[PDB]
């Protein structure tokens, strides 16, 4: 009726809850974590604790830090810096602590802007068409890899039948889940998401043959002009021919 969690099991559930708060996973497993916290960490593990840990890691990052994401100028092995491997067992993520520049990498979004007007556009869109204000397409034919740097993280780019690795200045991780690309979201006086991320796709695999990305390409717009435009698109990566 009751379950006791080991060091590794509790750490992975801790990481899973942190990942759920980052809005990277849709599920978590948090059974035995209260006692795992009160047994190893010594403090309560409510939503306030986690929010503060996320805040301190991704912002106000100042000095060394242990695997539990606690800083200070069992768990008494504080390492220098560079990265953290947030692995829950079901989903792994390579997260980067704050650097002097993370601040301006980070857009706010707590209040999204207006829906930009709509324009009729083609959905039969191949990869070499790059006239977006929101997109950027790079092809490395030398390593047969496709990188899709995005410049507007708020516009969503839902993948389909695809297996990608997305890079960013906050956290790099791999996605195979079909649907919207899941981006980290930090809460500190509001919701902060990264300014831009890159999506690398290995063409020379066999895993992304039937990969299709559906997004909203933004094109520039008288009587006041300056209208922003939006049109749906089906970007295919199919290396069939």
């Amino acid at each position, epitope marked *: *009726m*009751e*379950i*006791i969690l*080991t*060091l*590794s099991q509790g750490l992975k559930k801790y990481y899973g809850k942190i990942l759920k708060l980052l809005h990277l996973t849709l599920e978590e497993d948090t059974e035995g974590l209260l*006692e795992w916290c*009160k*047994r*190893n*960490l*010594g*403090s309560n593990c409510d939503d306030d604790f986690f929010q503060k840990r996320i805040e301190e890691f991704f912002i106000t990052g100042e000095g060394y830090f242990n695997e539990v994401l606690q800083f200070k100028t*069992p768990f008494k092995s504080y390492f220098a810096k560079g990265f953290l491997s947030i692995d829950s067992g079901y989903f792994s993520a390579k997260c980067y602590p704050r650097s002097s520049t993370s601040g301006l990498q980070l857009i706010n979004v707590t209040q999204h802007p207006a829906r930009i007007a709509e324009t009729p556009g083609p959905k039969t869109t191949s990869l070499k068409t790059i006239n977006c204000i929101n997109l950027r397409a790079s092809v490395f034919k030398e390593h047969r890899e496709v990188e899709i740097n995005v410049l507007l993280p708020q516009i969503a780019v839902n993948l389909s039948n695809c297996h990608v690795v997305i890079n960013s200045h906050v956290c790099d991780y791999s996605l195979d889940t079909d649907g919207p690309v899941r981006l980290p979201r930090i809460y500190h006086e509001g919701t902060f998401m990264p300014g831009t991320y890159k999506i690398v796709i290995d063409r020379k695999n066999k895993l992304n043959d039937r990969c299709t990305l559906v997004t909203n390409c933004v094109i520039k717009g008288r009587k006041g002009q300056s209208v922003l435009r939006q049109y749906k698109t089906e970007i295919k990566i199919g290396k069939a021919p």
Partner: antibody
Amino acid sequence: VQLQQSPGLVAPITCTVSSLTNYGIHWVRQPPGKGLEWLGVIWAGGYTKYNSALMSRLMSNSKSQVFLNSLQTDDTAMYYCARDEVRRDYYAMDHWGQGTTVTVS
Amino acid sequence: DIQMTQSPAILSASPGEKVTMTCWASSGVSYMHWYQQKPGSSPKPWIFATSNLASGVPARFSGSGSGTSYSLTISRVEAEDAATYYCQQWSFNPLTFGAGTKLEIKR
């Protein structure tokens, strides 16, 4: 370094250790007849967990000291103090004091 | 609530013989640990996390098993090994012990 506990009589307890700031401390008893009942643990931060069979009738340092109602004769036992070594396998109580025999009469 | 049944309860072995004793859980556990108690004194930790010997424990001792069923084996019976051996398991919360195995030397 080994741990040493304070024998006694009660009607119908101290463990001396040698750090309470780093380690959980456990209680163990042996009813006469070589048996064993797990009773509880106090971790370094002071949170507690109890065996539900004790019905919340029972536990609470600054100088390396650990401190212990409606007593029954079934509770006559040798009492052991013990401590967890955290790792990738838990519990693993490796040092035990000698115990104190309690007779309920 | 999670009963641990160890078998045999009583066993004897001639010196230098290989022995083995089992511990059975009503529900499966991740690992089993075993403690050695010798009559009239404090219990000693003997094997933890299924098969790791505590420091000082001679290499003639070993542990094995998985799921519900775990074992303790002695490659050479020694005179100092007469004693009661108790299993206890993790993933309970009501942590529970087995009843012990008393090992006599058949001299």
